[PDB]
């Protein structure tokens, strides 16, 4: 049917029995990553061809590939076999994380660190993280992660509330061998306990919290089609969904009086990164790339009705591929449904005597994932007026370390000993524009004040203006909160009735941006962190900010790899890429589980339409 | 009952019966501002001396003045004569807005413009503006009106349409004289209606929502007494209403546990002003102090069940003073309801196999307010996790102007010859704190980068630097976004479990502040519009930004007079005055009635609790 619809079981079952048929998939092998690819540019719904790109690791030790397959046709489209020395190590595989604690048990080095701080190996749970790229150079060319302690007193103890300080060790999850293990000292194992549902802690819980019920009587007012597309108060789109991004929002249109008008061809989070900044050699080299790393989508929670999703509720139960190649589903892994959004345009007119008044409304698509102690909420809406938000939710438990005697200018203190390491989680959303179709361009658009004399002798006027990005060798952007800079992208050959080129402004929330040092491993390999915005020439191989393998791999891929092309991006089929995020430096109100923080960024209409899209919407 | 409690219509007949006993309401005069004096410092005295403060004018000329009566005791406190040219008028009657259109009517330069324009000066409404001060002596002392013309094809016509430009008047509305009748030159009246409500403009309806129900089976989780004071989830509140200021929250404290915490004495937006950035001669001079000059809490709208608020609602209908002294209700004038909010905390933990998800409410507070063509929702949030949230939301018809012949680089298009003139909405919330008590201190918080090297040799460190504002003037302080910067208002003397100064941490938009030349009128007269945050030592008699009579005073008075006193607040009785404002450059969107669009601030604990004080929220 329509090539944007979710990947069935069927074809994941059926691009594992071509591969097999390839040679490509024997019992050393295992998908470390699979997705079906967007249709082509111009296919136009016209004889299908559903393609999937494959990651394929080899437990062995042989070099991994990278393979497409058209699951339509039967057949290996290309096999590649991989340098990751060079071109970066495949994303983490879920199996290899529970190997790092399981080595780390039987090794002399780890039991004499857990000995000298009295601690029982059976209780001392490991966080096996990512590696990143420093200077271990036995590491170029191995699959490594690194493991940080926390002790479990019991099994419904959270581990999180007694970290190991002074302790960290490197693992080489394919050969299974520790290859260091670094003691820098024993540091108090920080004794209160997290647990937020014991009684004693949360004390007597609140009876004071009446009821809210949210129904819809008449059931929702968006139409779900062909299993993924939606269609609601004017909008049009398709909900797909990738292991690595999560939820992918593609054609997203408006459909203006006769015509379907195209906003945003494909909208994602196309990358995700958590540097932290403290400077002990124990977490130094901590940076989680959620989305490149580990695959943001595979762990995404099947979601409660009432809790998680409150009111009239539509899910999509997405499929993706296990480590051998089988369909696994996730059970209501997203929710789909509107929510009342307050007033949208109200005005008592005095001389006309006409008093009006109309609510706003807001269709919202979003998922929920857990990574370790962090779980984070992704939110897209879409409102009456023709905006389009994105809203990301932090939430979890703090990653934690000991609280140094003495203070600490890199990390805060929570509870007795029991620090926080302060950090940022930084998005990257890319937005492959389709204003009216693709022909689009991006200006700039900042605020100008004016001194007063001649043309402005009482010092009131203020102007405003805009600089085309015409080639991506200028489009790498910062922030402006002081002039109000936005972005409008728009179509110069597309123009409203007041003949001018129609489109959206982009407002961000001019949050910082990444602060580590510039000559950093962290500020290359995440260099799209370091500009607000970049705009580059749509390119079917330029999906990630970071490059296709993250996973222990050195800058030289990315972002900075596309724009140096120094393409027309000046009315071009392009893609705009927004960096976003919050900078967190963890209080006590944040332990023993944190409330829900926010960051994100929304586009409104600007000159897109011939005037405003809802006047049409009713007294309710 | 409280100190605090609302004004009833019987202490406002009793105010009126004090003045006109006392020979100070005769026949000339009129209540221009009228409203209840909040409690002293320290007045635990019990002794209840509920006093009102008066502003009157004198129709027939005569000097205005200032009282100040007791309801308890029925007496004159206080009765100033103010000398207006020095200390500004008194805010515009309601009444003298309809002199304008009236004199005008008569004035043969008036119709002369209107009959080269071919304008039946019985279909033009002229909007009543306030003059500000500029170049014409003439004006100080005297209470001038600026009038602007708009045509009305019908009594239901929207007259915004149809702006005439090239034209504008100024009025004495005492001594009812016109003293000035501008005419720049002839420019089309944009001939294209604007009436929303018109089938032919909003073509047939919608047919496609569906409703969605919001509500309370048990009723609402939260509890009015004493008229207007509201316990809720911990929070503990009252909610006042000043003609002026609109909604005025005193008392905002939280329940930790044993004790009743202060965390805000008082909070208020205590002014808002609209400054036009058009250098024509026309609209050079327009700068609307919604609050100071024509006072918001007056025109407040009555809201509607399901339409203006949604859900259970618990309704306040505030009494205020008609221009004789008599007490007039605003029935339903404002809003409380709780709401849902989505994820409060949520941490699916793999090591305890504990999946823990918890639902978030905010306690709203709002009413909406017209001023001529703009429409303004104010809302205060309160939500469960401590978080103190304002938010603004503008709406109505935008001011209109001709759209120039050759473009215009301080004026927008919205229809064909239809001009929507640049501007700013810059709020001020005057917020009195009180954390943990009246000794407070604020300090600018910044996110420090640094360099890699000896202590940071992997160039991943950050931290962050706090500077404390010990003086006035040292308290005027701008935005960095860039950096994050934050400022945070902490007891020196309370201190958590870890021993850090309690506190609470404001988080600003950072939106651009006042845009005019430094030199300007309105920067001299708005001068708080020009930084976002202040800091001055409490006084009584500091009430507003801009001082206590707005309209046509000269400048410097409020803020910049205040701060330059110098005082010491460092661990003192301290209030904070935060600038933030929308910046607008009117789209075709936005035509013919606009949607909502907003700003705010908010403020989260920040080592004011001992651990999260949500731990205590019960599972859905
Ligand atoms: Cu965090
Ligand atoms: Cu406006």
Not at 412 to 438: K, N, V, Y
Request: charged share 25%; glycine share 8%; with cysteine.
């Amino acid at each position: 049917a329509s090539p944007f619809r979710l990947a069935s079981a069927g074809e994941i079952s059926e691009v594992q029995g071509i591969l097999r048929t390839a040679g490509l998939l024997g019992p050393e092998k295992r998908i470390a990553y699979l997705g079906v690819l967007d249709p082509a540019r111009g296919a136009g719904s016209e004889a299908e061809d559903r393609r999937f790109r494959v990651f394929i690791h080899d437990v062995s030790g042989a070099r991994p590939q990278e393979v497409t397959v058209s699951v339509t046709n039967g057949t290996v489209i290309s096999a590649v076999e991989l340098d990751t020395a060079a071109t970066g190590e495949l994303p983490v595989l879920e199996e290899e994380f529970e190997v790092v604690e399981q080595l780390l048990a039987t090794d002399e080095r780890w039991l004499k660190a857990l000995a000298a701080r009295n601690l029982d190996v059976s209780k001392v749970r490991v966080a096996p993280l990512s590696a990143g790229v420093f200077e271990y150079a036995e590491e170029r060319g191995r699959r490594i992660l690194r493991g940080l302690a926390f002790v479990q007193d019991f099994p419904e103890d959270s581990a999180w509330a007694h970290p190991v300080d002074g302790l960290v060790a490197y693992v080489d999850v394919v050969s299974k061998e520790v290859t260091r293990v670094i003691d820098t000292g024993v540091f108090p194992v920080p004794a209160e306990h997290g647990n937020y549902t014991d009684p004693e802690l949360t004390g007597p819980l609140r009876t004071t919290q009446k009821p809210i019920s949210i129904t819809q009587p008449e059931g929702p007012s968006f139409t779900v089609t062909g299993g993924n597309h939606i269609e609601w108060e004017k909008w049009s789109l398709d909900v797909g969904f990738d292991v690595r991004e999560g939820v992918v929002l593609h054609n997203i249109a408006f459909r203006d009086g006769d015509r379907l008008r195209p906003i945003i061809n494909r909208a994602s989070i196309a990358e995700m990164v958590v540097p932290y900044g403290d400077p002990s050699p124990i977490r130094s080299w901590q940076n989680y790339f959620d989305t490149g790393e580990y695959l943001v989508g595979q762990y995404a929670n099947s979601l409660e009705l009432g809790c998680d999703c409150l009111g009239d509720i539509t899910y999509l139960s997405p499929v993706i591929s296990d480590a051998f190649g089988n369909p696994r589903e996730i059970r209501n892994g997203i929710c789909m449904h509107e929510e009342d959004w307050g007033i949208l345009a109200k005005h008592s007119d005095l001389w006309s005597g006409i008093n009006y008044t109309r609510r706003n409304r807001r269709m919202v698509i979003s998922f929920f994932t857990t990574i370790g102690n962090y779980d984070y909420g992704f939110y897209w809406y879409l409102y009456l007026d023709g905006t389009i938000e994105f809203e990301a939710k932090a939430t979890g438990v703090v990653f934690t370390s000991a609280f140094p005697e003495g203070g600490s200018d890199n990390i805060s203190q929570l509870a007795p000993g029991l620090g926080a390491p302060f950090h940022q989680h930084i998005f990257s959303a890319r937005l492959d524009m389709a204003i009216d179709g693709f022909t689009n361009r991006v200006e700039e658009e900042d605020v100008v004040r004016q001194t007063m004399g001649p043309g402005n002798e009482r010092g009131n006027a203020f102007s405003r203006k805009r600089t085309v990005l015409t080639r991506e060798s200028e489009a790498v952007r910062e922030a402006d909160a002081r002039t109000g800079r936005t972005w409008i992208i728009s179509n110069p050959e597309s123009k409203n009735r007041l003949n001018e080129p129609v489109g959206y402004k982009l407002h961000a929330h001019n949050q910082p941006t990444l602060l580590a040092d510039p000559g950093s491993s962290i500020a290359r390999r995440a260099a799209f962190a370091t500009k607000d915005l970049w705009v580059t020439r749509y390119a079917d191989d330029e999906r990630y900010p970071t490059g296709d393998f993250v996973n222990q791999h050195s800058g030289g891929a990315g972002l900075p790899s596309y724009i140096a092309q120094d393409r027309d991006i000046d009315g071009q089929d392009i893609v705009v890429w927004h960096t976003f995020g919050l900078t967190a430096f963890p209080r006590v109100e944040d332990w023993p589980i944190m409330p829900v923080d926010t960051v994100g960024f929304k586009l409104r209409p600007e000159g897109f339409f011939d005037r405003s899209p809802v006047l049409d919407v009713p007294a309710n």
